[PDB]
Amino acid sequence: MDKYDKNVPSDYDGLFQKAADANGVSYDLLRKVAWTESRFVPTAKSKTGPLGMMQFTKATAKALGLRVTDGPDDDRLNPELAINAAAKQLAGLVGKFDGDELKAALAYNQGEGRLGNPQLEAYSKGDFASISEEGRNYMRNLLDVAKSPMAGQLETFGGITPKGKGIPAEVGLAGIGHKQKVTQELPESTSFDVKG
Amino acid sequence: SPMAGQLETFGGITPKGKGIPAEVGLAGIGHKQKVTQELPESTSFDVKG
Amino acid sequence: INSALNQEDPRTAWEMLQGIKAELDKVQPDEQMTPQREWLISAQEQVQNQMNAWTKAQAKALDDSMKSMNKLDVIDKQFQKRINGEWVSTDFKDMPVNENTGEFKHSDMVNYANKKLAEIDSMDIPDGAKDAMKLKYLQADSKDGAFRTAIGTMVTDAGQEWSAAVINGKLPERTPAMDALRRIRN
Amino acid sequence: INSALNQEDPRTAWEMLQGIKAELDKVQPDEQMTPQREWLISAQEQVQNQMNAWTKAQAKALDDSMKSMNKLDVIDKQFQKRINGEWVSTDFKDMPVNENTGEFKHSDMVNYANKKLAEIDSMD
């Protein structure tokens, strides 16, 4: 997983354009958010591990106003309605932040409340020091595909010199990793078949 | 307390500094537990003929 | 800087170092190399080394879990071959062994049996088809398998019920095991 | 300073270092960096490293005990299913195994039986 694979042959993307047109969200932002949350991986295992493309949590799933209490313990497993709900939430966030501010809407990552309101206030003041590390990294990962008035102030935050640019962790730690030695190539058995 | 300000200015690196409580100097340093209370579930062999 | 280097997640340490660099930019507002920017460059290099060591452990853990999934897949394939009419052994000691599986254990068969029973229970079919599938898995199972161990409690309880009834000269008010075994016989 | 760095509990070492800093403030009553304040800054960094290594061991021990508690919970669930009339095996060799339990032992069943008997005896 490098550079988000912008022009890779688009796998299972017959849903993002329709949700984007229905709700008004940018196609690139929605696709990038889906890739960041799940990397289009069908298993998406974690502490909670929602295998859906939008790696939600139970609290957010219920707060979205869906009928989540259905199916396999969670109804947001069929991709289309989960993606549509995420697109509607993103559109509501973008619209409510005075214009096309495509990065304050990343309150999507932190929410609004006891841990999200002060960070949004700090973003409004342009004081990135009061935003958490998780929020700062999550916004850094979306700088390539986003339209914001503070997209240039965030990239020049954390430079080694005041004229330098900060380095996102996806670039500073890029390329460092180890391959898995176990593969899904299973051993095969043979039947003792003697047709006399 | 009347000595709440004298205790905080105790242990500073300089006489005009403030001491650092261990809850702040060692804050954030820790490791997560790899074991969770998510138990494996068993299934009954139920055939109602 | 030292507390940012003692985080368990390197991705958090990197962002903490970026914040510290932003703080330092307000007291050293020029472009030259100072002994305090060397601190931060060394810290970032150390965080890269930590990322290497972290990816070691992540890959190893993922391999450990993937071996268990592979063993379950192999057992499932073996029962599928046996049910279709092929002459293979469904004992866990006779499963094919690879570098992607390792050696098989009894708990692997226990987990496979539990997972298979749950999956059959989650199917959208009438109860007769579910019983037919469960009995196919019971018939294909080996002598000391988990499917035969789960239903062996029924047989033990039914035998105990009958023997105790003969000794006491009266059937108890409830004989759930005998009724269940008789229905399975039907 | 070296004795403060040889404590088993890092939280005690930190407070010992704060006391040593307070002692040093009475002989170096100014704000400049001296080779003796470098001693104390290095000592505090070493104590932070010790705290990291200490949290390793604490987390590992807590995981080890939590696995035993999880195994007892699994055995209790299995007997509860069996008593209610389900056809499951209550042998410790047939308990479901996870990454949160490990492998079961005979002593696990011994401990479960003793605990269950005591709990039944403590009922009103």
Curated annotation (Swiss-Prot), chain B:
It is found in: Virion; Host cell inner membrane. It comes from the Viruses. Signal peptide: none annotated. Component of the cylindrical core that assembles on the inner surface of the capsid during capsid formation and plays a role in viral DNA ejection into the host cell. The inner core is composed of stacked rings of gp14, gp15 and gp16 proteins. Following binding to the host cell surface, the internal core is diassembled and gp16 is ejected along with gp14 and gp15 into the infected cell. Gp16 probably inserts in the host inner membrane and remains associated with gp15. Belongs to the transglycosylase Slt family. Homotetramer. Interacts with gp15; after ejection the gp15-gp16 complex composed of a gp15 octamer and a gp16 tetramer probably binds both the viral DNA and the host inner membrane. The N-terminus contains the transglycosylase activity (Potential). The C-terminus is essential for the viral DNA translocation into the host cytoplasm. This is Peptidoglycan transglycosylase gp16. The chain holds residues 148 to 196 of 1318 of the full protein.
Curated annotation (Swiss-Prot), chain C:
It comes from the Viruses. It is found in: Virion; Host periplasm. Belongs to the T7virus internal virion protein gp15 family. Homooctamer. Interacts with gp16; after ejection the gp15-gp16 complex composed of a gp15 octamer and a gp16 tetramer probably binds both the viral DNA and the host inner membrane. Interacts with gp14. Component of the cylindrical core that assembles on the inner surface of the capsid during capsid formation and plays a role in viral DNA ejection into the host cell. The inner core is composed of stacked rings of gp14, gp15 and gp16 proteins. Following binding to the host cell surface, the internal core is disassembled and gp15 is ejected along with gp14 and gp16 into the infected cell. Gp15 probably remains associated with gp16. This is Internal virion protein gp15. The lineage of its organism: Viruses, Duplodnaviria, Heunggongvirae, Uroviricota, Caudoviricetes.
